[PDB]
Amino acid sequence: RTIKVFTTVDNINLHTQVVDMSMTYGQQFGPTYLDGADVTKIKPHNSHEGKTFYVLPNDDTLRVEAFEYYHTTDPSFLGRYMSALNHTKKWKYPQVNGLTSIKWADNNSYLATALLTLQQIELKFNPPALQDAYYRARAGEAANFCALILAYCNKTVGELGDVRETMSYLFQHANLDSCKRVLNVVCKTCGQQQTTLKGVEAVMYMGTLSYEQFKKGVQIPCTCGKQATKYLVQQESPFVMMSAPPAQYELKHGTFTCASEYTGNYQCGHYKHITSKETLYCIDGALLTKSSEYKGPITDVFYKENSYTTTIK
Ligand SMILES: Cc1ccc(N2CCN(C)CC2)cc1C(=O)NC1(c2cc(-c3cnn(C)c3)nc3ccccc23)CC1
Ligand SMILES: [Zn+2]
Numbered sequence: 001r002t003i004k005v006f007t008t009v010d011n012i013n014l015h016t017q018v019v020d021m022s023m024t025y026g027q028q029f030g031p032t033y034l035d036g037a038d039v040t041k042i043k044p045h046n047s048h049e050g051k052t053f054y055v056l057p058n059d060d061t062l063r064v065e066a067f068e069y070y071h072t073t074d075p076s077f078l079g080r081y082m083s084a085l086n087h088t089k090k091w092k093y094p095q096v097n098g099l100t101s102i103k104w105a106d107n108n109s110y111l112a113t114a115l116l117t118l119q120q121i122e123l124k125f126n127p128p129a130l131q132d133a134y135y136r137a138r139a140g141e142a143a144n145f146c147a148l149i150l151a152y153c154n155k156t157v158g159e160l161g162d163v164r165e166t167m168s169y170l171f172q173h174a175n176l177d178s179c180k181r182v183l184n185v186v187c188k189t190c191g192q193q194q195t196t197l198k199g200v201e202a203v204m205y206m207g208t209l210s211y212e213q214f215k216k217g218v219q220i221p222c223t224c225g226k227q228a229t230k231y232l233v234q235q236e237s238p239f240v241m242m243s244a245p246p247a248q249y250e251l252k253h254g255t256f257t258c259a260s261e262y263t264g265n266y267q268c269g270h271y272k273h274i275t276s277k278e279t280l281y282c283i284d285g286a287l288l289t290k291s292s293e294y295k296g297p298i299t300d301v302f303y304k305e306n307s308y309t310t311t312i313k
Contacts, residue, residue, distance in 0.1 A: 035157035036084035054083035071127035085147035109271035122238035182234035235308040260300035
């Protein structure tokens with residue numbers, strides 16, 4: 001009982017291997033990886049026929065090099081990255097409206113939306129190999145950056161993803177120490193409670209798409225049971241990301257940087273990227289659509305920032 005698959009050690013040369021289905025990939029090839037997953041302790045599936053597997057034997061110098069260059073301690077990182085890279089190298093990366101995008105394939109709508117957003121926000125990555133991949137992605141060659149996004153998010157090629165979760169994971173690898181957010185929460189029976197958030201917690205919010213509604217005050221539930229009002233007191237970050245579950249929202253030109261439109265059910269839909277240039281543009285992978293006004297199911301909105309201070313007494 002066998003299947004025929006392809007193995008690779010360099011992502012350039014493929015070798016047809018006949019694999020025995022009664023043994024795991026590990027006992028036949030050593031550390032084996034497929035589309036961003038570790039298949040070492042897994043027995044071959046019928047679906048694996050014709051697929052390309054990355055083989056990466058265990059070397060202690062590789063593990064140490066991964067900590068220094070990728071900033072990871074997961075011994076499967078390199079193999080998951082290399083195996084995902086085999087697939088992301090097969091994708092097309094068109095320049096849509098001056099930005100590097102990804103032509104739709106293997107449910108990568110979320111990857112394209114994240115990639116297009118990353119080109120419009122001031123960000124510097126701490127892992128040296130991630131920052132190098134980021135520079136190359138901005139210049140057009142984005143296959144390595146995409147494989148690293150899948151690797152840092154623990155995702156596989158073909159598996160749908162959330163743009164907000166992807167951003168959350170990537171921001172943990174960005175230098176956001178100088179980012180600061182001061183919030184005040186007011187409950188009629190609890191009082192006022194000021195909170196100071198730093199790093200990723202200072203640039204992301206879940207509950208509303210409007211940065212103006214956040215500045216004015218938003219209704220959140222309090223630990224007492226009553227409703228409280230949370231509002232933005234101070235903000236010191238180069239950008240802000242306001243997210244909420246997909247809902248019909250009106251995007252007015254020049255009021256935001258870029259946004260993520262999500263159409264369809266939870267974990268079933270498709271992403272489109274809306275960006276505010278001289279007019280509103282909608283980048284749907286390799287497709288582009290102009291428009292003066294916009295209303296659709298938005299789930300993420302990014303705004304520009306330097307320093308904000310509330311005028312609320
Ligand atoms: C595409 C995808 C892949 C993967 C994961 N997960 C997220 C949870 N991780 C732990 C595993 C991966 C989610 C989505 C996803 O659908 N995320 C979004 C989303 C959609 C709706 C939604 C849309 N229509 N309807 C009826 C509901 N509700 C939401 C509520 C809260 C938050 C997000 C919601 C569009 C942001
Ligand atoms: Zn309270």
